[PDB]
Replicative DNA helicase
Amino acid sequence: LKVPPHSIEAEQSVLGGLMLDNERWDDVAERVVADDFYTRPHRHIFTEMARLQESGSPIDLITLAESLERQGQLDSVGGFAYLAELSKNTPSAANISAYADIVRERAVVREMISVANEIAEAGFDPQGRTSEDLLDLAESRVFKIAESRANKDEGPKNIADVLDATVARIEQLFQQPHDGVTGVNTGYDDLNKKTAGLQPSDLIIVAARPSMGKTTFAMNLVENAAMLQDKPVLIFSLEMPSEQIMMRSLASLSRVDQTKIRTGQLDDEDWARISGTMGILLEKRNIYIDDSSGLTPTEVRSRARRIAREHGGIGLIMIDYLQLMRVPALSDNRTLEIAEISRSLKALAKELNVPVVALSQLNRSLEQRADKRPVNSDLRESGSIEQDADLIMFIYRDEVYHENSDLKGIAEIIIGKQRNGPIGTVRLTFNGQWSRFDNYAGPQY
Amino acid sequence: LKVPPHSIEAEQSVLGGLMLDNERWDDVAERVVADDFYTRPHRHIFTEMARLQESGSPIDLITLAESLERQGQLDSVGGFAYLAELSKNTPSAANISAYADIVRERAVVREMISVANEIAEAGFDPQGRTSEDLLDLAESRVFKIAESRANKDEGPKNIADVLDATVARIEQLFQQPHDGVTGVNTGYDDLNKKTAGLQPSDLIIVAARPSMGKTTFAMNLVENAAMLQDKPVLIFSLEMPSEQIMMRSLASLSRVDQTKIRTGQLDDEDWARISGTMGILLEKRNIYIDDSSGLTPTEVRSRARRIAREHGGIGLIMIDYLQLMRVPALSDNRTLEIAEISRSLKALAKELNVPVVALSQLNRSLEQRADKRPVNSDLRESGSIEQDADLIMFIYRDEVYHENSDLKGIAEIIIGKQRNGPIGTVRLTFNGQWSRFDNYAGPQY
Amino acid sequence: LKVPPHSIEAEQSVLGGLMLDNERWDDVAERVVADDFYTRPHRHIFTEMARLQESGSPIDLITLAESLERQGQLDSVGGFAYLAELSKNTPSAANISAYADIVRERAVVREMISVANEIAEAGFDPQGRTSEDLLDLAESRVFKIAESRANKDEGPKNIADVLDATVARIEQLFQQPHDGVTGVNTGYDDLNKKTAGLQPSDLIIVAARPSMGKTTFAMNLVENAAMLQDKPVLIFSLEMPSEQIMMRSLASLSRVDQTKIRTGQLDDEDWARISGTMGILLEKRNIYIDDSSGLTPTEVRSRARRIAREHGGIGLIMIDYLQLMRVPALSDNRTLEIAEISRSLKALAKELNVPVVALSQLNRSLEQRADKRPVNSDLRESGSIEQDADLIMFIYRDEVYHENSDLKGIAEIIIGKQRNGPIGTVRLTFNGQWSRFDNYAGPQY
Ligand SMILES: [Mg+2]
Ligand SMILES: [Mg+2]
């Protein structure tokens, strides 16, 4: 019931794994230490192995016994006969660092109990000592423990440990001298300038009123990517089903109208363009659609990670009308619901290192404003999706509100926020007959 | 001979298959969850393995054991001496899927028997209850476990898995070469261009101020759809009772004044029409009406599903003045109430694969606007109506407000939103003496 | 404890009722069926009497035996000696319809447990069978149960039923004396329609805010019922004593104000109308009043049954501000205390076969809402008494709230629930200067 908590079987398993593989010792040398172990024979074995890996790389069965022999230690450290059992056991695979980490943790635990014993000792043993000379000692010891637990990554880093990563990214980008696109491209040249391409660890938002084009624009982004991104994409159509999506997308990629598709009065050239774009999409095999209705961020994360390990690793994610996302815990408070959603999506993007398009709606506030250009406040709910987002870009198409516009066939992509870049107003030509946005070779902005 | 149904060979085999194959947990995690398993040690083991494949993938023999020792459950779930025997056993190849499948099947059956025994328990124990709660209890439990189970067409589909269905639909339409109508005809060819008929998965919205005749239009639609489609139709008269509904529908059908019905001031010349319409209606057994007051979403769902599986599968729905539809929990928050409403209607359509008309009101925002041609934002409440919709077509009779125009007797159907089609300015003619809209072969609209 | 539940006493009583009454076969046949019984001889007698009441009118004692001899089945169902006891027993009064309905309920329950065991067997016995065809079996079975149901009024209606009333209008509607009532006449003809009077074996709930007039209504009811019936009625006034109740009632009847009564400013023209109604209220001796404070449901039962035996059988029970009812067992937990009291009053309603008027309050959840027209949830405790009652109806007099109103003097009785009919919303008139609701002569609602 009561004992020093220690695991000693996985310990020997690590020992034999190091024996049968003289390559991966540095990675466990990061974690495991000679005094980390519990019993002294294992400690002798590991520290001898370490002294040898300084000098003698080959250490499996006999170099160990020889180095142990030259200084006269056989049968005082167990035995070569006993060592046979260690090399015999654990022919296991690269599942070694797990054992290493967990036993390293057990060592930390054992040390904690040791120091609690020391504190109890110094407590019941006064030695003519005061609370002020005692609690301060206790604080200093526990401080030395928690401060130094062989942990480097999670803690606040000195600047030289940050500039290494910064210069590393700069070398990753200079070592490939290429265009002014530091991530995913869209297919649109007027927008890649104000974005440097959809960057790879952000939460993009694509918001606009309902009849405006945001699902259309998003599908255009993803299909263009998947035509120039040899790497998967995802599409979560929580609103409409896959069979509307793909129809819209064939119309987009082939510049034929949607009625002609669904109803079936299309001409030989139309049939040909369809044939070609199909036979393209079926080769690259990027697009993966999920027409699930009421998802949660957990389901999103799982269904994205499933791809991201087996189909390689992914290039972007699209999410239609995230206000349908749910989390039943926060089912009463809608505001905190959306905040949890958005935080989880940003976390996902930082996890998988991809962008996360996340379509959203706007509120019926701009209608009584007479300009109609959507400002960042005009987001459907919670105000936090303008806070966790590293990019927002609204859509406004003046022909909807003004029949007397000189701005018809024209949609402008109001960048309404961008942390790592400028704001602006891109413009593009709308042709919803085949559900596409296209570039605008015309006046500047 | 008889036992609560379960095998163990499949179960333990899958468990060891996961012990020695740590990559294939997705395929297994999709299907089986801890509560599926029969015995407790296996459940503890499974939840720990999920916990580990979340963070730490490599788990074979003793990583799980130390995860288990973090709970201190040594030997409560068998023991390392036992779990090692499972590590030895079941070297199983790709037959993990089928073993997990039969484990799952036995568990679902087990749940069904549990429900049967529990209903028998509440039967022998009347518990101070009347059967009007008990039949509903049986229905609710059975379908709850059904739809809690039924969501097994899920996951991120591949692209070809989409295009199969898409092209199947396109062929199904081309396999019936007919007019430009894919859905439910409206009877108004001026309208059946822009819409291709009331599509089979949509939420249509017919809306205008009360003195425009929205109810007349929807009754005309369901009238025509019952006459054309040899298929059931439902109606929910939340506002008024059937005594007016039928007496107005017959006026729509047979071109006779409503007054001349209720007052008897008719003649045999018109009565020929009446007797014809009636006799046509009875031998079809088509038009179904519910003259309730405040029905909720799930009441509507159950009723529609009842009429569905009995009489083939329904073909249209009308829902007048949805605002009366309540849900008691969301009585404080009106906005979330209407949101829930609209979402349930849309998912009902998706369930039955039919259309869902739903009339709705407009606010006093546009009276003080000087144009009065309604817009999508004027929809009286909550804004998610126009976001969860597929087709919004208003009314604007100019005659009611302006008088000096030749557009009188002429009601126009402003399509103000359509995802899978265009916007428009349809014009139809009005004869309110018998409550109908008719076509208009007039100048270009 | 654990048994197939089946009514046998009331069963034989219904059978002997059919014996001693050839008339009452139609409506009883609309509910009970030969398969509705438990044992065989009862089924034999029922099918014989059904075949005979089709053709052979006289069946009380002898013609049953004559037909039983025509088919030659003597001593198969007992015998004529076994039969004589059936005509011997059950001299009961007209209370047979409730017996028939509860036996129908018991048959439905018996079917339910039979199906439950069938499903248990089907689950234990796959016989090489996918669970698809097993859950489908169960669900199809449940729907085949609940589909037929011998019930066609809670739900939509085929057009055959609609056109029944629609054409019945145009010929047969000379029925304007629709006094179709079964139970206690409420004294309100506009209200007696939608409720069908107080069905004598249910639980009524009258509830509203305090300044609203509910006690005045639930005194008006017993006030009329004392006069119309020649039957006693009970008044458990847990709020205020008899001396104010009666001083109110005299004023309700005589049409003078409480003030002049408790003051003495009243002349001959009031003296006469007091003397008359006083004389009427003495010449019947129906009403009994209990000015208690802290009654328990046990005391409710005891004090209804002290009088139910002496005076024939009581006609109406009236509890005032229910929530004061205590039970010192559940003196800590309020929720289960209220649920206990509700179940107890419903049990008493079943026991004496009388209607229970039992008031309640409304929490302050409507007053954070501009509607202020209450609903089923605004019910002040436990959400329990919206289940143990076949009737609820709430009140709303707007002119307590709005001083500007043109709805003053007026008070709608919202009916929030019925399990034996449709809900509605009456529109009375309130004149509290003499503490009365009157039937309203005005426009629609
Ligand atoms: Mg969309
Ligand atoms: Mg009172």
About this structure: Residues A 215, 239, 320-321 surround magnesium ion (ligand 1) (CB under 6 Å).
